[PDB]
């Protein structure tokens, strides 16, 4: 029977609601990956700096520490694969599938990360 469905559909219908990438000013001078421009990235895209570091760690087996603006990360990583990583980060962590909102916040939800959006309150995969 396709008659009580129609009403439901109608109800559903009734109740309904990129240049942002910054230039990475970094020398590929390696052995230890140094990102001095990362503060600007954090600022422009509206994000805490630590989350990006965490993402990087998740991507590739690295070990380092946070310093005030500048990063000391172990590894010789280039100005194109890091760039690719950045591009990915900007493609999925900034973007929310249901509604593209600005306000996104960090949450440690158990070992794998899952962030929350301040506008609606939805759990997004913070790994893929």
């Amino acid at each position: 029977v396709g008659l009580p469905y129609s009403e439901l559909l109608s109800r559903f219908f009734n109740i309904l609601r990129k240049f942002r990438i910054p230039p990475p000013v970094c020398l590929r001078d390696g052995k230890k990956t140094i990102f001095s421009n990362i503060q600007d990235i954090a600022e422009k895209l509206h994000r805490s700096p630590e989350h990006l570091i965490q993402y990087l760690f998740a991507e590739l087996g690295t070990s380092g520490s946070v310093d005030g603006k500048r990063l000391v990360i172990k590894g010789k990583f280039q100005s194109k694969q890091m760039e690719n990583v950045l591009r990915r980060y900007i493609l999925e962590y900034v973007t929310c599938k249901t509604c593209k909102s600005i306000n996104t916040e960090l949450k440690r939800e158990n070992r794998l990360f899952f962030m929350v959006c301040k506008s609606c309150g939805s759990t997004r995969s913070v790994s893929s």
Partner: protein, 408 residues
């Protein structure tokens, strides 16, 4: 309100990158297990939902939370039923797990998005499997409507209707839902109650339990003087279980390694039952329960108990490595957008055979017109007869060929 455990097994079927897990989340509240040791052995996301209805109409009755302030009525919701979710993977490689899930299920939920193609193969295959393994209670759900237009959705619905006519299933409810917006779940809940009657189950019915997960409840730095028994994370199809019963694990075991595999089934006595949060004496069928038996914690390690069947004492299932199947083939393959004729079986070829739940890959030894001899790598079992679904690798994905029955 007393904390009552699960009453009926509800499963979800669909396609890859649609968001079945998301749907499950929307329905309940507890996050899915999938996507190292704890909640990793099973490929089915565990979800605890609640059906408590207020009777102080249609959609304004069902709620997620037990506390009621949202619709308008000041009174608390009345006890109906508690439900658990079995989320099978909708991927083309791990179909064995899906098949395993299927036999455990009592109610089905189909998900189709209104943006992709109309005749979807995987969904069709799933439907076929459902038809095979005795699951006449099917509910159709629409996943994505917000991205599409007014008439497009209607067209999609019409197409769906056209599709479901020639099949065995005729009476199936249809609901439009959004997982991310959190709406129209109440209607779904209502449907779950109204359309599907709960089958009668006493304490005389042949015990039937299927173990998917294995638990070793041991703290890092605990003495031998105080030890907890091995916990088997298993779901009950039928038969009510209580504390103080004899259980046997039936797919056999490889112990002595030269050496024949002629051995008795794995006997065990129940110590404790782990459900919801607190310990309980009774176990209502139709849900995954951490059954703590006299089995070792060494056996319940990580990847040793995968789809192993459990039965109560005084019933005899059977250890099978070589199976005698009576198979029937269809005319043309179901699960393409390009219908192809079903070819005859070739000797020594990797196929996937699922006797009810037993997730097994089998090689063909002898080819006959009606009978087939199959050699199994992973262990399998036979209860009395059990409805069997067959699947073959032709074009990257597992594709259904027909139905089978064991002659023993």
């Amino acid at each position: 309100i007393i904390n009552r455990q699960a009453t009926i097994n509800i499963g979800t079927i669909g396609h890859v990158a649609h968001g079945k897990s998301t749907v499950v989340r929307a329905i309940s509240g507890v996050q899915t297990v999938r996507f190292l040791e704890r909640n990793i052995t099973i490929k089915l996301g565990y979800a605890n939902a609640k059906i408590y209805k207020c009777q102080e109409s249609f959609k304004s009755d069902k709620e997620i939370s037990p506390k009621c302030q949202r619709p308008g009525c000041p009174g608390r919701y009345k006890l109906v039923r508690h439900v658990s979710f079995v989320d099978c993977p909708g991927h083309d490689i791990l179909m064995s797990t899906m098949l395993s899930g299927a036999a455990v299920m009592d109610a089905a939920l189909l998900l189709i998005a209104g943006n992709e193609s109309c005749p979807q193969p995987q969904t069709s295959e799933h439907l076929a499997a459902i038809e095979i393994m005795k699951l006449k209670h099917v509910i159709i759900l629409q996943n994505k409507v917000d991205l599409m237009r007014e008439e497009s959705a209607l067209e999609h619905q019409k197409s769906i209707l056209k599709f479901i006519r020639g099949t065995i299933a005729d009476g199936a409810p249809i609901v439009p839902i959004s997982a991310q917006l959190k709406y129209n779940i109440d209607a779904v809940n209502e449907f779950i109650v109204k359309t599907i009657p709960v089958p009668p189950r006493d304490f005389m019915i042949s015990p039937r339990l299927i173990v998917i997960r294995s638990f070793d409840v041991n703290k890092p730095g605990a003495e031998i003087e105080d030890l907890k028994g091995g916990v088997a994370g298993g779901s009950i199809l039928n038969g009510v279980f209580k504390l103080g019963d004899e259980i046997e694990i039936r797919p056999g075991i490889v112990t002595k390694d030269k050496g024949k595999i002629q051995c008795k089934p794995i006997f065990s006595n129940i110590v404790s039952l782990f459900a919801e949060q607190n310990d309980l004496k009774f176990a209502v069928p139709g849900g995954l329960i951490g059954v703590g038996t006299k089995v070792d914690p060494t056996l319940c390690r990580a990847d040793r108990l995968v789809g192993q069947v459990v039965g109560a004492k005084g019933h005899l299932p059977n250890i099978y490595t070589d199976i005698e199947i009576n198979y029937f083939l269809l005319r043309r393959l179901l699960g393409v957008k390009k219908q192809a004729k079903v070819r005859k079986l070739e000797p020594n070829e990797v196929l996937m055979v699922n006797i009810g739940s037993t997730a097994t890959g089998a090689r063909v030894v002898a080819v006959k017109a009606d009978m087939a001899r199959l050699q199994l790598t992973s262990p399998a079992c036979t209860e009395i007869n059990e409805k069997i679904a067959l699947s073959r690798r032709i074009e990257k994905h597992w594709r259904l060929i027909g139905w089978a029955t064991i002659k023993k």
